[PDB]
Write a protein that binds this ligand. Structure first.
Ligand SMILES: [Zn+2]
Lengths: 177, 101
């Protein structure tokens, strides 16, 4: 497994999931395939606590599960769940989530600038802050509707995102082969 | 249960566990081994990672700071708000191609 894939997964798990998730994933990075029981004993988590962490990582498609069903020494049927990181699905979910996050931010920025800050009490025309200043009437000293001339009434995250997410973009690019 | 003389011995034990894949160490086992363990544990600061179990017992892990990455919680909540658990993997790939990625 390429070092850059490992690092991508380690970065993303730390940034967007809890400590518990990071520590569970560390085991799956150390070893290709691991029994849930072995993970349980290593981490000292409660049983439901671990299962919930694994359920979350499986839902976000970071890890997959393969059951092994065998006859045990005492003759009973045994069901082991072996977990592993699925790097092709992990990289895709990461791209999917980052693309939608960006787009949600972009949409919020568009909405905020197109926000109807001013509204005519008569004809109900609305105006954005940019539109509003060219509504000012120096002869009355007030903002007046462009249509009926009635006095109008009242009523960056992307840059941060781009700063904070660049390490992941870089690791994504590094893995593109 | 553990031989932990001092702060330095505590750090080396946690380090070795990390390096050797030996797993988490319950805080209470450390408290038994190391007098005034609260001093040593506090002194070591963020070199230790703590997990809380449901019974409120604490588990200790070496903090490897090689991979360190973090974002504003608004971005954490935003990440969570993009659902993928209900989605076919194929559907995810379709989206990526639709958008040119
Ligand atoms: Zn009007």
């Amino acid at each position: 497994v390429p070092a850059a894939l490992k690092r991508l997964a380690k970065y993303v798990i730390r940034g967007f999931y809890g400590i518990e998730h990071a520590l569970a994933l560390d085991i799956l990075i150390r070893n290709s395939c691991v029994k849930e029981e072995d993970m349980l004993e290593l981490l000292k988590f409660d049983r439901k606590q671990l299962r919930s962490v694994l359920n979350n990582l499986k839902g976000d498609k970071f890890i997959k599960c393969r059951m092994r069903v065998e006859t045990a020494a005492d003759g009973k049927t045994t069901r082991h769940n072996y977990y592993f990181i699925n790097y092709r699905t992990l990289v895709n979910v990461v791209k999917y989530k980052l693309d939608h996050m960006r787009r949600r931010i972009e949409t919020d920025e568009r909405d905020s600038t197109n926000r109807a800050s001013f509204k005519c009490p008569v004809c109900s025309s609305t105006f954005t802050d940019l539109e509003a200043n060219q509504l000012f009437d120096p002869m009355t000293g007030t903002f007046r509707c462009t249509f009926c001339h009635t006095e109008v009434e009242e009523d960056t995250l992307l840059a941060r995102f781009n700063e904070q997410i660049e390490p992941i973009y870089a690791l994504l690019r590094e893995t593109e082969d | 249960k553990y031989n932990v003389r001092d702060k330095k011995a505590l750090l080396r034990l946690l380090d070795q566990h990390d390096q050797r894949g030996l797993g988490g160490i319950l805080l209470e086992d450390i408290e038994e081994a190391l007098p005034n363990s609260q001093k040593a544990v506090k002194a070591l600061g963020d070199q230790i990672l703590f997990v809380n179990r449901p019974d409120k017992k604490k588990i200790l892990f070496f903090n490897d700071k090689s991979c360190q990455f973090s974002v504003d919680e608004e971005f954490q909540k935003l990440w969570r708000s993009v659902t993928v658990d209900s989605m076919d993997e194929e559907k995810i790939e379709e989206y990526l191609k639709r958008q040119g990625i």
